[PDB]
Amino acid sequence: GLEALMSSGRVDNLAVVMGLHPDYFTSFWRLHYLLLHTDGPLASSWRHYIAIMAAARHQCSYLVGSHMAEFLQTGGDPEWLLGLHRAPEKLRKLSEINKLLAHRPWLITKEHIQALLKTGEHTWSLAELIQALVLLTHCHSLSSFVFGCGILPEGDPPSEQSSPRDVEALMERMQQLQESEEMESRFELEKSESLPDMLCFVEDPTFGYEDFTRRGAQAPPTFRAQDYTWEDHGYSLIQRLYPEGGQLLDEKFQAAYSLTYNTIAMHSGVDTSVLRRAIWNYIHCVFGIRYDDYDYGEVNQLLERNLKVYIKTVACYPEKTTRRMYNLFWRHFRHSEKVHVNLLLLEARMQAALLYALRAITRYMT
Numbered sequence: 001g002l003e004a005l006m007s008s009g010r011v012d013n014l015a016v017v018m019g020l021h022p023d024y025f026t027s028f029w030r031l032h033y034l035l036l037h038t039d040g041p042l043a044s045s046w047r048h049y050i051a052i053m054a055a056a057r058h059q060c061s062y063l064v065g066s067h068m069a070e071f072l073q074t075g076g077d078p079e080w081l082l083g084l085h086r087a088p089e090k091l092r093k094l095s096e097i098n099k100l101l102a103h104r105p106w107l108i109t110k111e112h113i114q115a116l117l118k119t120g121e122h123t124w125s126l127a128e129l130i131q132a133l134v135l136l137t138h139c140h141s142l143s144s145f146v147f148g149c150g151i152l153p154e155g156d157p158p159s160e161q162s163s164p165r166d167v168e169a170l171m172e173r174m175q176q177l178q179e180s181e182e183m184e185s186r187f188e189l190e191k192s193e194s195l196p197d198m199l200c201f202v203e204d205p206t207f208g209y210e211d212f213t214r215r216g217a218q219a220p221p222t223f224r225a226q227d228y229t230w231e232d233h234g235y236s237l238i239q240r241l242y243p244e245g246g247q248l249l250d251e252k253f254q255a256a257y258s259l260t261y262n263t264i265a266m267h268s269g270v271d272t273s274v275l276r277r278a279i280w281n282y283i284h285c286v287f288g289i290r291y292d293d294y295d296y297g298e299v300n301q302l303l304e305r306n307l308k309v310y311i312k313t314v315a316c317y318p319e320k321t322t323r324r325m326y327n328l329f330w331r332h333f334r335h336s337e338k339v340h341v342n343l344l345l346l347e348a349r350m351q352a353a354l355l356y357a358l359r360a361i362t363r364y365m366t
């Protein structure tokens, strides 16, 4: 870990906890320095205010307070802190797509995109729009991480949760798998399986993953992953429209997926990719992405009930994550590994939210 930096306490609590995984932290920092503290299509103030709007969706005062203050240090019109109504209209057209990216990103559709790029008084460029989707999706994923890891605000420990044998059954069930049409059905099962200043920076403040305008549970339309992967499509679209951070996203996703230490709590010497794949592929399943190679039954085999709850809660309702919830799962796993799960899920989530919105753009582009 980056002990010296972490306890320097010249970087915020969020960044401290990321330090627990230096190989992720580097890719994390590059994107964060970029989005918030480097040139690019939108002015600093706008990038910080966009960050507020995304953070607001999960009532995440860590990121809202933070960005309010950056917005202010960077000479933002302090009147925008009184609510969206005072923001410029261009920045408010973003609310619809902000909401959806946060909660139901599968609902993003060419019309939503065509709304922004609709040539009017102040219009979004694709360059600007892409930066904003990266900004929105980033502060969402960082809201997950913030509640997920119990990250504490700076104003007066750096988390209320981290603090800087079924385990051997799990290692067995991993073994068997690595030793090796109803796959379309197992997906539909797993997907359907069910588990206040800020308000003036949002629309529809109660819109969430779950729909309370329909009886029964929420399950998003199944989407065949390989109609529009990051690898084949979304990356290419971003490096054409927001190159300087297209690569930093492809690098971050790569860094989170492939981050292993070959450790699985007590044990050295293990290949965990099966288990990592299962966390990844599940979270995508929660947002409706079905990979046609995956035996989606591997999920229930490998991810315990409490993990799935925490994961889904951090992904879909991070506001509602709690200490109980945090300890209740993987009782015997190291804290660091708890944090690792957060990395996996934030990147998995961000990628889905993006991919839906990129696909939306690629649709309006035709």
Ligand SMILES: CC(C)(C[C@H](N)C(=O)O)C(F)F
Pocket: 259, 260, 261, 262, 263, 264, 272, 273, 275, 276, 279, 337, 338, 340, 341
């Ligand atoms: C299983 C775990 C903890 C990863 C593990 N620390 C590893 O080294 O691969 C992660 F996938 F949650």
